[PDB]
Design a protein around this ligand. Structure first.
Ligand SMILES: [Zn+2]
Ligand SMILES: [Zn+2]
Length: 287
């Protein structure tokens, strides 16, 4: 997000050079080049410099940008930075499933710069939302269902803990399907791999690469994903508390220690219990 700020502050000539790298040549009706390649060994390139690949000037790769607005140039530059970022991540990524998603998104964004379009993810994985009621609604229903009768102070503390839990879920990294496979039944794995891919494309990667449409984990998923992940999230949360507790202000420290474990235990019952009412779209409280 800081390399983004820096490139968006450059003179327009330099911005066009950066974009020319990812832009189609229109020197003539037959040139099929998809990007200007600087002929110099690796201050703005002159528009007359000839592409290494196709020998047509930079001008002919960026002429479509001559009259576009400043904000549209900056949107495109954002995609360039995300393309650079995804490219690094693809090469660095050990996990197959993750690497393939990063590579799909890399190609998607590169193609959008080439076509001056807006990215949208597409494939057999479907599009959001994935399940209703979603996690955010389930958790709201849970707080009403179990805690409505508490005194207003204790009730506020549960609400605050619910908001913290939802914020955690929205930034927490899911297990890879390979990790999930090591603790689960083999037939559960294919369904988790679809949800993990959805999660990466719609939720997690867009947090780092904001040219992609961004959806909250807790808004597009529901009980099924929550059943897959919750026991690990819970373990990770309680462990993180053990590590960080003493950096919290004492009021928060005490409240987490004495109310959060039970909140999580009680939510676990509603997540996995066949008989829970909080996952019905019709959920309401008595008058
Ligand atoms: Zn050309
Ligand atoms: Zn070219």
């Amino acid at each position: 997000s800081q390399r983004k700020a820096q490139v968006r502050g450059l003179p327009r000539a330099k911005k066009l050079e950066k974009l020319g790298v990812f832009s189609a040549c229109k020197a003539n009706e037959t040139c099929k080049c998809n990007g200007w390649k600087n002929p110099k060994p690796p201050p703005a390139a002159n528009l007359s410099e000839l592409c290494r690949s196709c020998e047509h000037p930079l001008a002919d790769h960026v002429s479509h940008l001559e009259n576009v607005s400043e904000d549209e140039i900056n949107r495109l530059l954002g995609m360039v930075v995300d393309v650079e970022n995804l490219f690094m991540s693809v090469h660095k990524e050990e996990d197959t499933d993750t690497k393939q998603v990063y590579f799909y998104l890399f190609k998607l964004l590169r193609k959008c710069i080439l076509q001056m379009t807006r990215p949208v993810v597409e494939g057999s994985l479907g599009s959001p939302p994935f399940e209703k009621p979603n996690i955010e609604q389930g958790v709201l229903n849970f707080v009403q269902y179990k805690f409505s009768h508490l005194a207003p102070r204790e009730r506020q503390t549960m609400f605050e803990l619910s908001k913290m839990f939802l914020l955690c879920l929205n930034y927490w990294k899911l297990e890879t399907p390979a990790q999930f496979r090591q603790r689960s039944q083999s037939e559960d794995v294919a369904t988790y791999k679809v949800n993990y891919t959805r999660w990466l494309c719609y939720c997690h990667v867009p947090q780092s690469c904001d040219s992609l449409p961004r959806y909250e984990t807790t808004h597009v998923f529901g009980r099924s994903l929550l059943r897959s992940i919750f026991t690990v999230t819970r373990r990770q949360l309680l462990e993180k508390f053990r590590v960080e507790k003493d950096k919290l202000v004492p009021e928060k420290r005490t409240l987490i220690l004495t109310h959060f474990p039970k909140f999580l235990s009680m939510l676990e019952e509603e997540i996995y219990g066949a008989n829970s009412p909080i996952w019905e779209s019709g959920f309401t409280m008595p008058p």
